[PDB]
Design a protein around this ligand. Structure first.
Ligand SMILES: Nc1nc2c(ncn2[C@@H]2O[C@H](COP(=O)(O)OP(=O)(O)O)[C@@H](OP(=O)(O)OP(=O)(O)O)[C@H]2O)c(=O)[nH]1
Ligand SMILES: [Mg+2]
Length: 300
C-alpha cells in the first residue's frame, strides 16, 4: 500500500519522459516543474522539495541527456535514485543489543497507533526473526489501555507485563526489563503513555523511563495521514529525547506520502516500519527503493 495519489498525479509527466527516445533539456525542465508541483500538493515539506528538485535537475542535465543510448531511462534512474536516497537508501534493520534483552521504547501521541503497533512488532519479531519478545503496559493514564494490550498479547501467546494503573511507568519498566533478563527474553517492547498533544508532563515521564530502561531503540509511532503534522511531531520528539526510528502507521489510508518523504530529511531519523491495517500481521519493514518504485508506477 501507499502513495497511490502521488503516483496518479505523476503518471503523465513520468510516462511522457519514458515514451520518448530523446529528451531535450526543455523536456527535463517541464517534467521538473510538474514533479515539483506534485510533491508540493502531496504535502511534502517544501524545503525538501526544493533540495530534491535542484539535486535531480543538476544531475539530469549532464551525461544522461548527451548520451542517447537510453536518455529517458537515465532521467528516470536519477529520480528513482534520489527518491530512494531521500527515504533512507537501504532498509534500516532493528538493532540487537550486545547483552540481551534488546529494549524497544514505543512513544507517540494518543491515536497514533502505539498500542496496536507494539503488538504488531512483537508478532513480527517472533515470525520473521524467531525471537522471544515481552510486551509491557506502561500507559496507566487511560483506562482500557492495559486491557487492550493484554487482549493483543492473548492473541500472540506472548506475555504482557503489568502492575495496574496505580504504579509509576518508571517502576513498571524497571521490573519488566529485569524479569526479561532472568527468563531470557530477546526483546522488551514498552507501550508508553501519551495525550493528544505534546506536553511537559509527557517528556518528563518519558525521560525518566528512558533513564531506567536504557533502551537500544526508541521508536516514534506516528500517523502517516497527518502530513506535515507528523513531521513536526518527530522533530519535537527527536530533540527532547533521542529517537532512533519511526513507525509510519495507516499507509493503507495515506494516498499522498508527504510524511513518508519528509521525516528522515528533516529529523535524520529513519523510518523502519510501515503499518498497513488494523490486524496484527499488518506491519512490514520500510524499504526505500520499493517505495520509490511504487511512486514511479514501477511496482511489482
Ligand atoms: N487502518 C489502520 N488503522 C490503524 C493502524 N494502526 C493503528 N490503527 C488504528 O488506530 C487507532 C488507535 O490505535 P491505538 O493502538 O489505540 O493507538 P494509541 O495507542 O496511540 O492510542 C485504532 O483505531 P480505533 O481507536 O479503533 O478507531 P479510530 O481511532 O481509528 O477512530 C487502530 O485500529 C494501521 O496501520 N492501519
Ligand atoms: Mg495506546
Amino acid at each position: 500500500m501507499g502513495f497511490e495519489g502521488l503516483a496518479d498525479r505523476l503518471q503523465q509527466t513520468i510516462s511522457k519522459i519514458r515514451g520518448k527516445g530523446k529528451v531535450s533539456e526543455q523536456d527535463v525542465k517541464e517534467m521538473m516543474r510538474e514533479v515539483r508541483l506534485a510533491l508540493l500538493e502531496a504535502d511534502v515539506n517544501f524545503k525538501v522539495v526544493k533540495d530534491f528538485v535542484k539535486k535531480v535537475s543538476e544531475r539530469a542535465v549532464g551525461q544522461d541527456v548527451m548520451k542517447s543510448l537510453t536518455p529517458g531511462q537515465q532521467v528516470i534512474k536519477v529520480v528513482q535514485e534520489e527518491l530512494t536516497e531521500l527515504m533512507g537508501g537501504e532498509e534500516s534493520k532493528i538493532a540487537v543489543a550486545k547483552r540481551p534483552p534488546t529494549v524497544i521504547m514505543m512513544v507517540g501521541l494518543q491515536g497514533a497507533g502505539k498500542t496496536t503497533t507494539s503488538g504488531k512488532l512483537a508478532n513480527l519479531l517472533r515470525k520473521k526473526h524467531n525471537r522471544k519478545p515481552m510486551l509491557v503496559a506502561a500507559d496507566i493514564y487511560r483506562p482500557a489501555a492495559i486491557k487492550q494490550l493484554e487482549t493483543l498479547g492473548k492473541q500472540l501467546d506472548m506475555p504482557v507485563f503489568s502492575l495496574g494503573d496505580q504504579v509509576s511507568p518508571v517502576e513498571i519498566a524497571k521490573q519488566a526489563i529485569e524479569k526479561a533478563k532472568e527468563e531470557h527474553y530477546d526483546y522488551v517492547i514498552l507501550d508508553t503513555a501519551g495525550r493528544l498533544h505534546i506536553d511537559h508532563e509527557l517528556m518528563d515521564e518519558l525521560t525518566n523511563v528512558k533513564e531506567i530502561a536504557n533502551p537500544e531503540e526508541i521508536f516514534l509511532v506516528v500517523d502517516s495521514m497527518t502530513g506535515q503534522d507528523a513531521v513536526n511531531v518527530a522533530k519535537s520528539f527527536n530533540e527532547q529525547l533521542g529517537l532512533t526510528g519511526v513507525v509510519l502507521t495507516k499507509l493503507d489510508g495515506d494516498t499522498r506520502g508527504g510524511a513518508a518523504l519528509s521525516i528522515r530529511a528533516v529529523t535524520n531519523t529513519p523510518i523502519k516500519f510501515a503499518g498497513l491495517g488494523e490486524k496484527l500481521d499488518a506491519l512490514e519493514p520500510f524499504h526505500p527503493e520499493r517505495m520509490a518504485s511504487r511512486i514511479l508506477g514501477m511496482g511489482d
